[PDB]
Amino acid sequence: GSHMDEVERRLVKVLKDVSRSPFGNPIPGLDELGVGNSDAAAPGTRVIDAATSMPRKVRIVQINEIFQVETDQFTQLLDADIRVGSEVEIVDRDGHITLSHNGKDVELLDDLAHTIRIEEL
């Protein structure tokens, strides 16, 4: 093909990303994805896929839970409090994933936006 690096195309293990504002807007459920997982059907396409099937506005309905929330780094990401039921959008950029929300754009590593509870664009 022609390269075309998708959002989930990048495979990482560590918990780090680029940009200066990695935190912001609700939806970056880092410890939330742990459990969920989609692939087809409208009922949430999962960020991993919600960025190739002609994305427009991924509707956030949920994430997972709060059980896990013991991290100083997540403290800044918790500023949004992930409001399940909101409405956000995602878009690629030079082979990278970033959720664009009214507020600003975020990073959301492949480990973060792996199994979020959103809608199928």
Residue whose tokens read 């600003």: 104
Phi, psi of 90 (to 5 degrees): -130, 155
d(CA 114, CA 78): 18
> Going from the N-terminus, what domains does the chain have, and what CATH number goes with each?
1-121 (2.30.30.90)
Report CA-CA distances (Å) from 32 to 29, 57, 112, 115: 5, 20, 8, 8
d(CA 74, CA 71): 5
Number of continuous H segments (helices) and E segments (strands) in the chain: 1, 2
d(CA 115, CA 45): 9
